From a paper:
The formation of a moving junction (MJ) between the membranes of the parasite and its host cell is essential for invasion. Two important components of the MJ are Apical Membrane Antigen 1 (AMA1) on the parasite surface and the Plasmodium rhoptry neck (RON) protein complex that is translocated to the erythrocyte membrane during invasion. The extra-cellular region of RON2, a component of this complex, interacts with AMA1, providing a bridge between the parasite and its host cell that is crucial for successful invasion. Here, we report the crystal structure of the complex formed between PfAMA1 and peptide segments of PfRON2, which, together with our previous structural results on the TgAMA1-TgRON2 co-structure, highlights a conserved, crucial interaction in apicomplexan host cell invasion.
The invasion-inhibitory peptide R1, comprising 20 residues (VFAEFLPLFSKFGSRMHILK), has been shown by nuclear magnetic resonance (NMR) to bind to the PfAMA1 hydrophobic groove, but this study gave little structural detail of the interaction. We therefore crystallized PfAMA1 3D7 (DI and II) with R1 to compare with the PfRON2 complex. Surprisingly, two molecules of R1 are bound to PfAMA1, which we denote respectively as the major peptide (R1-major), lying deeply in the binding groove, and the minor peptide (R1-minor), lying above R1-major and making fewer contacts with PfAMA1. As in the PfAMA1-PfRON2sp complexes, the N-terminus of R1-major binds to a region of PfAMA1 that becomes exposed after displacement of the DII loop. R1-major makes several direct contacts with PfAMA1 (113 interatomic distances<3.8 Å), including 19 hydrogen bonds and a salt bridge between the amino group of Lys-P11 (R1 peptide residues numbers are prefixed by P) and the Asp227 carboxylate group of PfAMA1. While R1-major follows the general contour of the receptor-binding groove, it does so in a linear rather than the U-shaped conformation adopted by PfRON2sp1. R1-minor occupies a similar region in space as the second strand of the PfRON2sp β-hairpin, contacting the same DI loop of PfAMA1 but running in the opposite direction to form a parallel two-stranded β-sheet with the major peptide. R1-major residue Arg-P15 contributes the most contacts to PfAMA1 and is positioned within the same pocket of PfAMA1 as PfRON2 Arg2041 where it maintains six of the seven hydrogen bonds observed for PfAMA1-PfRON2sp. Interestingly, while PfRON2 mimicry is observed in the cystine loop-binding region (Phe2038/Phe-P12 to Arg2041/Arg-P15), R1-major establishes clear anchor points in the hydrophobic groove different from PfRON2; Phe-P2 and Phe-P5 brace the peptide N-terminus in the region exposed by displacement of the DII loop, with Phe-P5 occupying the pocket left vacant by Phe367 of PfAMA1. Thus, polymorphisms at positions 225 and possibly 175 appear to be determinant for the 3D7 specificity of R1 at the major peptide-binding site.
Author numbering:
A (entry chain D): 4 to 10
B (entry chain A): 106 to 263, 271 to 352, 388 to 445
C (entry chain C): 1 to 18
């Protein structure tokens, strides 16, 4: 599980 | 006469300057996707505070375990992200916030609090939820805490949810527990160092009087007295505005170094008494650092 | 309604850009 960041 | 200690003692009025729990800080509520959560909201940093996870392979600064292992294994810290948000050194935070004049030059503790506060859970644009953080003052690293809970140690449960409690452990001496509300000016308005050759008192008719009623607990050294004050301090959770302490509790101690007595009390002190046998401490204060000289009050 | 523990989410946002 790898988590992305969004704007 | 008028009290000359007023300005000096302002940082010791814990209910006013911190305004939340110390041992368990859950002074506010926030929302994530329609659901309400309790979260830390104290305005002061808590020096030496960490979370002990009962019967654990790791420490609380280890990232959270993933999937079905979440809350069973791992620690409390933010899991790895793309790009990596936690842990973040002081230098990396200042570089990351280089375009923001209001954040890039904040003191390290405030910066770690603001950095943790930038993470929106589930990218819910309506969420006011702000993760707390732990700053390691030795390695200069900010650890965003994914888990805002501080105590789960009911005789009931304590493969399943882990059991844990807040504590000032010797291994946490350089850690600083930070809510989303940690103030920019903490150094001037919050306690940090313990006061050597000083005893807290109460200003009455032009004289600094002794605290008239204290709760005496034995302690081998200052660190153990600070652990005791922390254990009995303001708590937003019943031990094992609903359960909100608002900063009210046994947050102050006068440590007698000779009789090895930690004299714990629950009212704000309003002056200091110069006494060679004493060290004045608070639940918020560093468990080891001492300010060597008694203050000169004008 | 309140919950005790925050779920482990898969995605996150950033407030950093005001």
């Amino acid at each position: 599980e790898f988590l992305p960041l969004f704007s | 006469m008028g009290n000359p200690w007023t300005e000096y003692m302002a940082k010791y009025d814990i209910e006013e300057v911190h305004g939340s729990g110390i041992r368990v800080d859950l002074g506010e509520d926030a929302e994530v996707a329609g659901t309400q959560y309790r979260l830390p909201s104290g305005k002061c940093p808590v020096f030496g505070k960490g979370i002990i996870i009962e019967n654990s392979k790791t420490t609380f600064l280890t990232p959270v375990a993933t999937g079905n292992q979440y809350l069973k294994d791992g620690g409390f810290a933010f899991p790895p992200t793309e790009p990596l948000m936690s842990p973040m050194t002081l230098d990396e935070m200042r570089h990351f916030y280089k375009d923001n004049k209001y954040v890039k030059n904040l003191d390290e503790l405030t910066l770690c609090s603001r950095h943790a506060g930038n993470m929106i859970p589930d990218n819910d644009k309506n969420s006011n939820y702000k993760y707390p953080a732990v700053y390691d003052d030795k390695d200069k690293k900010c650890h965003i805490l994914y888990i805002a809970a501080q105590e789960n140690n009911g005789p009931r449960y304590c493969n399943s949810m882990f059991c844990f409690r807040p504590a000032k452990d010797i291994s946490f001496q350089n850690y600083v527990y930070l809510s989303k509300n940690v103030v920019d000016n903490w150094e001037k308005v919050c306690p940090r160092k313990n006061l050597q050759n000083a005893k807290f008192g109460l200003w009455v008719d032009g004289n600094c009087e002794d605290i008239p009623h204290v709760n005496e607990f034995p302690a081998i050294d200052l660190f153990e007295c600070n652990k005791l004050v922390f254990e009995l301090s303001a708590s937003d959770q019943p031990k094992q505005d609903r359960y909100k302490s608002h900063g009210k509790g046994y947050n102050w101690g006068n440590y007698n170094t000779e009789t090895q007595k930690c004299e714990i009390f629950n009212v704000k002190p309003t002056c200091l008494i110069n006494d060679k046998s004493y060290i004045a401490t608070t639940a918020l204060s560093h468990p080891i650092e001492v300010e060597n000289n008694f203050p000169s009050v004008p």
